[PDB]
Design a protein around this ligand. Structure first.
Ligand SMILES: *[C@H]1O[C@H](CO)[C@@H](O[C@@H]2O[C@H](CO)[C@@H](O)[C@H](O)[C@H]2NC(C)=O)[C@H](O)[C@H]1F
Ligand code: NA
Length: 129
């Protein structure tokens, strides 16, 4: 599913991400935009052999099982495929664990490089919420 901007903002809010660990909703929307273009089915291989999955490009090295990432963990206890669903529940729940891991949203490289410190509120402008 490719979410619209406001549609994703609303879903993220309903699943408790607005201000989760102190991160306003636009931070989440911005991170999703640059990592997946709001496409739940996005996958991208990493040089180390792991793969990123879903709207928030969650990595198989630590967070989900895809059966092909040697030495990896599955800290969110889910198949990485769950992160590709039109229902963002698994992606959100896993993202809550990731953002609580110690480094906040710096766990998402694209957020650090493209969202952090910017006017992220712009990502939820005009949205009913
Ligand atoms: C694609 O992007 C994701 C998110 O930026 C990258 O995953 C990160 O990988 C680092 C190092 O392996 C890890 O410490 C982070 O926990 C992890 N974040 C997430 C959201 O999974 C991945 O390396 C890239 F392929
Ligand atoms: Na894994």
């Amino acid at each position: 599913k490719v979410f619209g901007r406001c549609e994703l903002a609303a879903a993220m809010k309903r699943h408790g991400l607005d201000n989760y660990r102190g991160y306003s909703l636009g931070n989440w929307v911005c991170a999703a935009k640059f990592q997946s273009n709001f496409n739940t089915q996005a996958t991208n291989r990493n040089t180390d052999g792991s793969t990123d999955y879903g709207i928030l490009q969650i990595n198989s090295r630590w967070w989900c099982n895809d059966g092909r990432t040697p030495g990896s963990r599955n800290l969110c206890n889910i198949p990485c495929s769950a992160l590709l669903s039109s229902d963002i529940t698994a992606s959100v729940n896993c993202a809550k664990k990731i953002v609580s891991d110690g480094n906040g949203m710096n766990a998402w490289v694209a957020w650090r490089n493209r969202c952090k410190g910017t006017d992220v509120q712009a990502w939820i402008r005009g949205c009913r919420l």
